[model samples]
Target chain A: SLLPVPYTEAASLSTGSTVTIKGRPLACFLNEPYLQVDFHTEMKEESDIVFHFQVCFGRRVVMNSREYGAWAQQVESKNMPFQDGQEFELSISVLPDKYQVMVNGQSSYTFDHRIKPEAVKMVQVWRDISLTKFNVSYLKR
Target chain B: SLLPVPYTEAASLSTGSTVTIKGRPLACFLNEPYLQVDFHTEMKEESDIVFHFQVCFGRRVVMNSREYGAWAQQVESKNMPFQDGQEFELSISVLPDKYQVMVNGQSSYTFDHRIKPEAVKMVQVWRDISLTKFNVSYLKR
Candidate 1:
């Protein structure tokens, strides 16, 4: 692995911000490896999440938010764009109304904002994957 | 963090065999960290699993088997013997009729044998935990 997993970084997200991740599943698709990305309200791993994106490679994707230690309604999608035994480029862009997720440059999924993008104080990426790159674009004011 | 996670070892089991694991969850229980142990029919990660034990730390435990590539009946338990934010010692003893699981020296769970212990060729320990020790008893014929 090029980068340590359970990767956490202090982050700030606003409209036009983009969080990009380049990683590969640790196991084959037949084994159902998972990838999780959480935008946390605080630096602590247990803090509330503003946006939670999880991928069960070759199976499904689930999105949700955790507020006050309780998870809200879960959003599930079966649109899997990740290839088996291959690295993937994941881009999450903070739009004014929602977060747009693109996989390998193709539109994949989206989650309407349940909490303001400004509430995210950190980003944590963990689970069954080898992370090679992780970046939070701060070019936009 | 003392040992590499996603640890795997070639193993053999009999009626008196025991598999012991010493590890700590990577995150606090409030974050619902997980620990999984699988007994596989082959050394490959995607091979058929004869026993699958998974723990959703602080929540519940699920046990099952993967046969031919599909998961069989799932057994769920809410008996959580693991302490919050602490290292744990787990022992799984293969019995004639079932697998008896112990946590910190206390009997916690048991699963009826779905496949013969002789079917297992490998054991894998993974998920959100830091492993320190993993051993499979080979003293018994």
Candidate 2:
């Protein structure tokens, strides 16, 4: 069976920590998927989401944030370069102002820090993909 | 039984294509270990090695090349940052001038194109590691 989804990984994502997600979408994922960055501090209604990024297969990328227990409006990026079954490398660097997301080493999306950046204690990835590389590293500035 | 060694992959590493290797060393690889990148023209005598990169357990990187049946003198890099049983990422970008290598997202080594880049019909990886991700992709510049 496929590994369980709604995967939550506790990580060190301070000011200098980087979340790197390297994997490919399974062929079955031809439509949409979701990934979230949130704090694990509360068990009610999912923690405070600092970033909510979604991939809509044939359309643009949709991103947003859930702060203070409400889902915010989505931000869209028209530069989606994803393929059905190709492996991709994504690095979300926690910067001073926004969280910069780079797809295959190029800046693609920026989610403003709606909530405190330090509130992101874990990364939650939804189903629809298989990951080969996922980790948080404290990158030296 | 252990998976085979000296893994060979038939690839279309055309210019602009990047080959990435994501793997972790075996727990017991604290001793001398190695891996190679070969340009296969003929099977005998190791097929014109383009990048013979190896790690010398403690913390040293050794590189070399072989062409037209002669082995080139080895080159060494003393900035090895690999650790025992730690997962690492290696990307080899085929530039017009040379092969740029990055280890764990940092520049590690570079080997000039000793032969025509298109002549690299396949890539051969060998020795002392368990690969979790390995593939070639036509990356956007």
Candidate 3:
């Protein structure tokens, strides 16, 4: 038996929170079955700002979606507010509560999973490169 | 009080050990004057095979001569066995013990810092993306 309550809303998925994560995703749960696109990013170098972004994804990215595209303008990586811009390539792999950002195949950055873990469907990318090449594989602890 | 310690080589950077992150032009450390390179990474996925790393630096990133680069040979990416076939526009920001991997413009991974706090330096990227980008920043604690 379960309580018939409104189990979905922006409130339950607010930022600065943490929740248990499990396998796959459910359909209709917002980007359900995939990674509902939600992102904010900036790039710069020595007092130089090359890129900025503000986009919303009605789309989803999942291990099953099986699609690859580069430079999702939603990423907006181009002639921005700065000249002599700096260019960097980053890749991502999602885990239970973090995102790993790698620079040029090396070093990385980790962001706390700040969205509804259940809403993530799949992963996607777009930028100045030809392919957002990366992979996902499950391992034993 | 500094002691002269000899460096020991490992047969594998990622064999038996959790991971091995090797980046040429590794991020530098403070007061060292230039970028020094080293590796520290954590598995970011529960899947059978997913790895992430970061070049530790002290309070500085991309100022001197240190750089960070990562290599992923995931077949799904069509970038077979360590051959950088395609360019994925990405950037990684260093945060003490961890890194943030941004794909195109999406924030995908945020890792934790893995060293005894207070040791850092400049970290940058190398060949592959033709483009050049670097940065330095601290998270909102």
Candidate 4:
């Protein structure tokens, strides 16, 4: 079955939450470890670019730029073009003071937890993106 | 609890095998069903100009002109500046006939599977990169 969940209707992003997409409760905007900001974006309704992604464990968020509206954690986009006409999985997992994000089984970002990692709970994921499948597993290291 | 699974290693990249990624059994390599070709790739390691990527599936896999190799799958690696001091996750999920690859979760590419998608089984991570983690999920369609 193909889950056709549209991006969340939530106008903004948040933390400490979980979203159910296509019979799954995926990690959505989970910043409960502390205060944070996170969200997925597209430049337009029909943008070829996934454009910008931001996550704030507390006051710190990637893509924190004044002009770009977010920080430009730019990478080689020319050789690593974003694929349109397809849906992908965008997820985040927190470990201690750092967070790990996964898109279709790939991990990205492992930086210091800008917030007090301990203060977070309810790991959340929600915002401009439509989350369709969410499942969680806690394996302590 | 998260399930402990093996990281996808050198995929048979040949004519037939199964690819597992993001906790899902991946098969899509192209869009059609046909004969098979084992898959593998040889990349240009150094370049003053930006690089591109492609995937070859069957005997049809050709690259850099008429050179017989894996399918030619090219991507623009000019999104973010490639920093030697940083380690980014180039998440590549191999499906039946299509491949979705992400660089640092910032960019991605999904293309038609080069050969018969069923002919592939193994998945490998290679080139000027280090491995951190992998996740997999299936579509609910």
Candidate 5:
């Protein structure tokens, strides 16, 4: 489980980018298991998404953005902080306005950046989890 | 892909039961990709959930029931008959009081039998798709 469950990369963000991820949830949280992480603007997976984290692991967490192809306002969260079968890390950070979301280290969830984390460019992380790591933070400035 | 994706079986339903499924949609549908099926009541994936279908492929479709461990009411549905990266069949049928769902064969969705489709004993289809077929009809008694 060293990445590859629909994982795609090619990305770049601004305000001190961050993005790490390590994963696990294949099933067991009463069988809910899901964890997405879109963010495409174009590397084509249907383009336009500028961030849309999702996670229904033990139930509920949805953030959204899709821009030109519909889907916009949506930001629910039950705040479960991942831990029914263990193995998670997630991170996300890119802030000037918002996009924080740290799970293993705790901060939890945040979004407020409608479009423009430099408009993404591609970063997909698929469902039901199993990756081992995925970085994306070419160090500041 | 002839089945083997979290896909469990050991099931049994009542009034004219039926539960076919065919799959495909590992990604596409603008990267939304999901399709769960659960009906457990005891083959343990943490028990109790007498019907909880989900989809979110081209967006929206949720149905629920998780009794006792919480999660009850929640039955959204935008009813997008699924078809972006194609291949689907599905069917649910169990009417005596509800549970219709068809898609690709048309009918769309339904569900109104709180529990007791003989209490279901496990079904689970699982996320992101790619199963080939799965049955469960036992004709008629």
Candidate 6:
């Protein structure tokens, strides 16, 4: 089943910090379905989207950058990992030059910083998926 | 803190590809442990390996690829996204001569085909993790 759900938080993230997202995407009970995770510069409707991670079961997963009120070219990963009602975990760790992504314990994606990493003040997730966990932390050491 | 699960399949793969794997590592609860996903030419105990992705959580996430019989050096992502006691999903797609991997609905890694693509006769995954789903399919036109 799908629900109207979104997660929005205001925080400052630094290098060596990490954010974890855990959720179960709604089963493909429709012709068109999608889920998205975004790192934003603000919580407003018209703000720069630093990294846009979107999954479209109607097609594929799309990655994009939105800046200067314009959308960048879409980078498509032609694989859809979500099933009809399945849970997934995604984590992003800040690096000096890039964001290290781990999905379900596997090395997933690395999003290079186009904007200053420190400029990312908000984390927003909008989806029909059921979120089980959302957390942020710095290195334990 | 764990459950029994394994992923294995017998099939021929080509340029257009998609495989989905869903699992939770025992470490999602506790781990100084590891797990693996591999492509092989046969189902025997000792078969020629085409591709291998391994995760080590002893300290942090370390990723390495093995082709033929030699290791391609150590490729560490420096961050472990698989937390203790969490679930995750991953997807892999085939390109003309390579494979693009997506985890938790995000782009993860792209592995170049070392052996001929036609040589892949089976897919095997074994680890200290609990798997809930394992499936593969071609693009639907």
Candidate with the greatest TM-score versus the true structure: 1
Candidate 4 falls in which docking quality class?
incorrect
In candidate 1, how many Å is residue A7 off? 0.3
* Candidate numbers sorted by TM-score from highest down: 1, 6, 2, 5, 4, 3
lDDT at position A86, candidate 3? 26
Off by over 4 Å in 3: A1-141, B1-89, B94-97, B137-141
Query: What is candidate 5's CA lDDT for residue B12?
Result: 84
Name the lDDT of candidate 6.
Answer: 0.66
| Model 2 lDDT tens row, A1-141 | 233343567755667768887776633222123333343433332566667776655457777776665667878887776655578788888888888888888998888777776676667654345566777886664
**In angstroms, how far off is B58's CA in candidate 3?**
32
Runs of candidate 2 exceeding 4 Å displacement: A1-141, B1-4, B42-45, B139-141
Pairs clashing within candidate 5: none
Give the alpha-carbon lDDT of every model.
Answer: 0.93, 0.64, 0.26, 0.31, 0.86, 0.66
Tens digits of lDDT, candidate 1, B1-141: 877778989998999999999999988887677889999999999999999999999999999999999999999999999999999999999999999999999999999998999999999999899998898888866
The residue-by-residue lDDT of candidate 3 on A26-88, one tens digit each, is 111211011121232211111111111211122322211111212222222222111112233
Task: List clashing residue pairs in candidate 2.
Answer: none
Q: Looking at candidate 1, what is the lDDT of residue A29?
A: 91
User: Candidates' TM-scores?
Assistant: 0.97, 0.45, 0.20, 0.25, 0.36, 0.45
DockQ of 5: 0.31
- Cα lDDT of model 1 by residue, A21-136, tens digit: 99999888977778999999999888999999989899999999999999899999999889999999999999999999999999999999999999999999998999999999
Worst 10 contiguous positions by lDDT, candidate 4 chain B: B27-36
- Highest lDDT: which candidate? 1
Each candidate: RMSD: 1.1, 19.2, 22.0, 17.7, 14.4, 16.7
For each candidate, report its DockQ versus the true two-chain complex: 0.71, 0.01, 0.01, 0.02, 0.31, 0.02
Look at candidate 4 and tell me the lDDT of residue B87. Answer: 39
**Interface Cα RMSD for all candidates?**
1.4, 19.5, 15.7, 18.1, 5.0, 18.4
**lDDT of each residue in B1-141, candidate 3, tens digit only:** 021111112212211122112222211121011111223222211111122222122222221111233233311121111112223344455544454555445664444543322333212222112222332333233
